[PDB]
């Protein structure tokens, strides 16, 4: 496509340069180009894909939240705030559909190993959850159920194939717990999931090498932060 004439190795190299330069839109385009070469991504490459799209959609979601808040105040006791909120919303939806399309056309069906399978299903739940945050029509329930089904399949695999301290297993639980709280109006399920996830991982920290799990340590702190915010 757009990145069709560039070597896969060059796209990966340029994705890493774009990350160092904080050019996440370029990083996402290079990683989409690399996925479109048709080869399975490695662990480092999967992280590059996720960071690039999480940063792009993160910025759009922050903007949508600001606009939505201004719009809510303007409708209390002109068309511009609504028009601009809809423009941002359509751009955000376009990015989520691009990620969901890559997941469902390339990445998910070819992922056989548990680590990659859970990683891509977590991403599918995340991008359906971002679409649910802005969904307001007769489609909202189906979008929410698509996020739930992706997270649930990922949870089923991670509990069977990964240790409780695996950062992908922990990150999935962190995000599925947030989905329960913010999207599915299930705060009790969100709290139970974060508590059991934290407790199970704490009991398994005895098996790990000292400087090998900085990511799991950071995710465990985020579960604790959410549990403090909610309880």
């Amino acid at each position: 496509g757009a990145m069709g004439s560039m070597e896969r190795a060059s796209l990966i190299q340029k994705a890493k340069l774009a990350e160092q330069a904080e050019r996440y839109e370029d990083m996402a385009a290079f990683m989409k180009g690399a996925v479109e070469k048709g080869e399975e991504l490695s662990c480092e490459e999967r992280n590059l894909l996720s960071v690039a799209y999480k940063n792009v959609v993160g910025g759009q979601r922050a903007a949508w939240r600001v606009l939505s808040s201004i719009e809510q105040k303007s409708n209390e006791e002109g068309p511009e705030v609504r028009e601009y909120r809809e423009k941002v919303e359509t751009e955000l939806q376009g990015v989520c559909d691009t990620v969901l399309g890559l997941l469902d056309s390339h990445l998910i069906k070819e992922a056989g190993d548990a680590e990659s399978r859970v990683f891509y299903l977590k991403m599918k739940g995340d991008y359906y959850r971002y679409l649910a945050e802005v969904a307001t029509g007769d489609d909202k329930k189906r979008i929410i159920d698509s996020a739930r089904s992706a997270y649930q399949e990922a949870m089923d695999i991670s509990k069977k194939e990964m240790p409780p301290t695996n950062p992908i297993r922990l990150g999935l639980a962190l995000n599925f717990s947030v989905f329960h709280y913010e999207i599915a109006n299930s705060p009790e399920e969100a709290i139970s999931l974060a508590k059991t996830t934290f407790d199970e991982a704490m009991a398994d920290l005895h098996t790990l090498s000292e400087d090998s799990y900085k990511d799991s340590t950071l995710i465990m702190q985020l579960l604790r932060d959410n549990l403090t915010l909610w309880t």
């Binding site: 995340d126 990150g171 962190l174 995000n175 709280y181 913010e182 985020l222 932060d225 959410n226 909610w230």
Partner: peptide
Amino acid sequence: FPATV
């Protein structure tokens, strides 16, 4: 907002 990763 709650934290996600």
